Amino acid sequence: TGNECPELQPPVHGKIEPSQAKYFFKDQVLVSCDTGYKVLKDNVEMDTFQIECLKDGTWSNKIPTCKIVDCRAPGELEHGLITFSTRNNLTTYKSEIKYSCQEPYYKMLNNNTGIYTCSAQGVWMNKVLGRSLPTCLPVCGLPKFSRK
Amino acid sequence: IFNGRPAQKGTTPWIAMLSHLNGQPFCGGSLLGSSWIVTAAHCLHQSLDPKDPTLRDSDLLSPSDFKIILGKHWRLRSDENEQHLGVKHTTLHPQYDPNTFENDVALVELLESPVLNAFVMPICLPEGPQQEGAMVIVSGWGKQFLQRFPETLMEIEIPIVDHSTCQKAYAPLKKKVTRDMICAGEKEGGKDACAGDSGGPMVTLNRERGQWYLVGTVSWGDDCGKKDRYGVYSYIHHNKDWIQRVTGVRN
Amino acid sequence: VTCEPGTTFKDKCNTCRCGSDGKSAFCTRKLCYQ
């Protein structure tokens, strides 16, 4: 009906709607990313990014790329230590950390899973507690010395 | 501690000393959780006037006027194991009776939590009641036989008496012995706590748990180590609910 | 070391009670300096 526009090359880890055989003048599409990824247009991470096709048959903007969700650094635990599930210290999407509790004077509450994985909402999470950190408790009645 | 044996350095890490800013001791205590000390209530108040046997804010010993010492062994001499700590609040039992001695238990909030180590660490709250004849251990820096003071912490290992046969002993001298109280000692007397032992703990070993539990604290007694008169202690399981309510301590 | 076999008196810093006889008294076990 108008002028035709180059078939779009989808982003890595990201959809495009609406998917069409051909694209024409006045048409407009939305670039999305998988669960756990946002769209990066230098230098900001948004949920969708939009482009139209112009009278001259070209796209209004180049296709952006999907940068992974990164929940930064796990919060410190008093009388506790953090250990990672990878040597490179991954903090990106779906990566796990185990909150250990310093021995032998402290133990963890409810002896919970103690594992924290990254939610796609960019947040370190535990399916028992949530965003709330574990609690490390004093160890009662266990003297290091016995009598002669 | 009458006819006692010197405590071995590190076998009683929960023991706490209640001493005036002066340094001079006056009661015992036991560390609960991270920043709490349990004691006898009467430790924490100046002797109420008999003309008005009721309690007042003005009667209670002030937080600024005493300190807590943890990891102490020598009665007067000092250590690098000692940790000197302030007092945020003190809380007596709401049904504590200064004249009857009922509910003779109180809690002291620490100002800064101590560094937990081999010589300093808490005792467990009792997860249940005590059987007749259970061997307990009682510890304190109190006056011993012949009325002198120790250089060290002193302890005694004694059986618990059944409440019934304890009551029968303190009647007909007409002194009440409530459920909140517990007795430890042998028929013919000989081993007891004494002056300067109040609040000092009475513990048991549990097996096959392998953990030491707090049973009760030094409360009162006739004289020290008298025949047919067992020493009375504050039963803790009876007031565990309150303690957990106040402190928020789970084992 | 006798006492009035009534009810409540203060033996130094410690609180006390006397039995049916005025001979013996049951007291708290705190340390005094007074």
Helix (H, G, I), strand (E, B) or coil at B25: strand
Q: Residues A49, A114: one domain?
A: no
Q: Residues A45, A81: one domain?
A: no
Which residue of A79, A107, A140 to mutate against B (max B Cβ within 10 Å)?
A140
Q: Residues A87, A47: one domain?
A: no
The Cα–Cα gap between B49 and B47 comes to 7
User: With an 8 Å Cβ cutoff, are B174 and C19 in contact?
Assistant: yes
Residue B170's H or E segment, with its range, is: helix B163-170
User: With an 8 Å Cβ cutoff, are A143 and B124 in contact?
Assistant: no
Which residue of B112, B121, B154 to mutate against A (max A Cβ within 10 Å)?
B121
Number of domains comprising chain B:
2
In a domain, C34, yes or no: no
Classify residue B249 as exposed, middle or buried by CB count within 10 Å of its CB (0-12, 13-18, 19+).
Answer: buried
* Residue in A81, A83, A44 with CA at minimum distance from that of residue A64: A44
User: With an 8 Å Cβ cutoff, are C28 and B48 in contact?
Assistant: no
- Amino acid letter, B190: G
Smallest CA–CA distance, residue B212 to chain A, in Å, is 4
Domain that holds residue B100: 13-122+239-251
Nearest CA in chain C to B19: C31
Say which experimental method was used: X-ray
User: With an 8 Å Cβ cutoff, are B12 and A143 in contact?
Assistant: yes
Please tell me if residue A104 touches chain B, with a CB cutoff of 8 Å: no
Residue B169's H or E segment, with its range, is: helix B163-170
User: With an 8 Å Cβ cutoff, are B222 and C24 in contact?
Assistant: yes
Residue B246's H or E segment, with its range, is: helix B240-247
Nearest CA in chain A to B203: A141
User: With an 8 Å Cβ cutoff, are B101 and C27 in contact?
Assistant: no
Domain that holds residue C15: 1-28
Nearest CA in chain A to B34: A138
* Inter-residue contact A71 to A119 (CB < 8 Å): yes
Q: Residues A61, A74: one domain?
A: no
The Cα–Cα gap between B173 and C26 comes to 10
Q: What is C1-34 written as a DSSP string?
A: ----SSSEEEETTEEEEE-SSSS-EEEE------
Q: Assign residue A114 a region: left if phi > 0, alpha if psi is -120 to 50, beta otherwise?
A: left
Number of domains comprising chain A:
2
Classify residue B13 as exposed, middle or buried by CB count within 10 Å of its CB (0-12, 13-18, 19+).
Answer: buried
Q: Residues A75, A129: one domain?
A: yes
* Residue in B223, B21, B54 with CA at minimum distance from that of residue C29: B223
* Inter-residue contact B148 to B194 (CB < 8 Å): no
Q: Residues B129, B56: one domain?
A: no
Contacts of B114 in chain A (CB under 8 A): none
Q: Residues A140, A82: one domain?
A: yes
- Between chain A and chain C, are at least 3 CB pairs below 8 A? no
Compute φ and ψ for A103, nearest 5 degrees. Answer: -90, 155
In a domain, C18, yes or no: yes
Last residue of a domain, one of A33, A49, A68: A68
Say which CATH number the domain at A37 has: 2.10.70.10
Contacts of B27 in chain C (CB under 8 A): 30-31
Q: Residues B106, B58: one domain?
A: yes
Question: Quick one: three-class SS letters along chain A?
Answer: CCCEECCCCCCCCCCEECCCCCEECCCEEEECCCCCEEEEECCEEECCEEEEECCCCCECCCCCEEEECECCCCCCCCCEEEEECCCCCCCECCCEEEEEECCCCEEEHHHCCCEEEEECCCEEEECCCECCCCCEEECCCCCCCCCC
* Residue in B199, B26, B170 with CA at minimum distance from that of residue B106: B199
CB neighbour burial string for B53-79, b if at least 16 within 10 angstroms, e if fewer: eeeeeeebbebeebbbbbbbbebeeee
CB neighbour burial string for B149-165, b if at least 16 within 10 angstroms, e if fewer: ebebbbbbebbbbebee
Say which CATH number the domain at B5 has: 2.40.10.10
* Inter-residue contact B179 to B41 (CB < 8 Å): no
CB neighbour burial string for A102-127, b if at least 16 within 10 angstroms, e if fewer: eeebbbbeeeeebebbbbeeeebbbe
* Residue in A101, A31, A97, A18 with CA at minimum distance from that of residue A63: A31
Last residue of a domain, one of A44, A68, A92: A68
In a domain, C24, yes or no: yes
Report residue B13 CA to chain centroid gap.
14
Q: Residues A112, A44: one domain?
A: no
The Cα–Cα gap between A73 and B58 comes to 51
- Amino acid letter, B176: K
* Residue in B72, B60, B80 with CA at minimum distance from that of residue B24: B72
Six-digit token pair at B237? 């399981």
Q: Residues A101, A122: one domain?
A: yes
Interface of C with B (CB under 8 A): 7-10, 13-15, 17, 19-21, 24-33
Q: Residues A1, A47: one domain?
A: yes
Strands B36-39 and B5-6, sheet pairing: unpaired
Last residue of a domain, one of A68, A89, A121: A68
Quick count: other Cβ atoms within 10 Å of Cβ A90?
A: 15
The Cα–Cα gap between C2 and C23 comes to 5
Angle B99-B102-B105 (CA atoms, 0-180°, nearest 5)? 110
Domain that holds residue A95: 69-148
Q: Residues A47, A110: one domain?
A: no
Classify residue A139 as exposed, middle or buried by CB count within 10 Å of its CB (0-12, 13-18, 19+).
Answer: middle
Active site residues of B: 42, 104, 198
DSSP 8-state assignment for residue B127: S
Chain position carrying tokens 């990824």: A37
Q: Residues A54, A91: one domain?
A: no
Number of domains comprising chain C:
1
Q: Residues A81, A146: one domain?
A: yes
Nearest CA in chain B to A143: B11
In a domain, C33, yes or no: no
Smallest CA–CA distance, residue C27 to chain B, in Å, is 6
